[PDB]
Amino acid sequence: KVYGRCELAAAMKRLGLDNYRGYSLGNWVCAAKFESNFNTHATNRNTDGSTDYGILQINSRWWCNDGRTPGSKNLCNIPCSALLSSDITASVNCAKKIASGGNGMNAWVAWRNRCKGTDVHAWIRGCRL
Numbered sequence: 001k002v003y004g005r006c007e008l009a010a011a012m013k014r015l016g017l018d019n020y021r022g023y024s025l026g027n028w029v030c031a032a033k034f035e036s037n038f039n040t041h042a043t044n045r046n047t048d049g050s051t052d053y054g055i056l057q058i059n060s061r062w063w064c065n066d067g068r069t070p071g072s073k074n075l076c077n078i079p080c081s082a083l084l085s086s087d088i089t090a091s092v093n094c095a096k097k098i099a100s101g102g103n104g105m106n107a108w109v110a111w112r113n114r115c116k117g118t119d120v121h122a123w124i125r126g127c128r129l
């Protein structure tokens with residue numbers, strides 16, 4: 001599914017991401033735009049053999065198990081295929097676990113390069129939430 005910007009914002013708001021660990025809703029919408037262009041089916045392989053899955057490009061080395069990654073820690077206790085669903089529940093529940101690490105949302109490389117520090121509140125402007 002390719003989400004629209006305000007459609008995704010509303011889905012994320014109903015799952016408790018607004019102001020989760022200090023981060024306003026626009027941070028998560030910005031992270032999903034630069035990680036996957038709002039595409040639930042996005043995947044990218046990493047050099048080490050893990051793959052990043054779904055709308056938030058969560059990797060299989062630490063977070064989900066895809067079968068193909070030797071020594072996946074699977075900290076979110078989910079198969080990586082669950083992150084490819086049009087339903088984003090599993091992706092946001094896992095995202096909350098990774099944003100609980102010491103560097104918070106800096107675990108999303110696209111967020112730290114293209115979103116961090118900017119007026120991220122713009123990403124939810126005009127959405128009826």
Ligand SMILES: CC(=O)N[C@@H]1[C@@H](O)[C@H](O[C@@H]2O[C@H](CO)[C@@H](O)[C@H](O)[C@H]2NC(C)=O)[C@@H](CO)O[C@@H]1O
Binds near residue numbers: 098
């Ligand atoms: C939360 C999450 O999974 N974010 C992804 C990053 O982890 C990806 O970064 C890359 O991750 C692998 C697995 O740890 C590292 O081997 C790799 O070096 C690292 N790459 C970079 C440039 O940091 C990232 C890949 O674009 O995608 C999500 O942000």
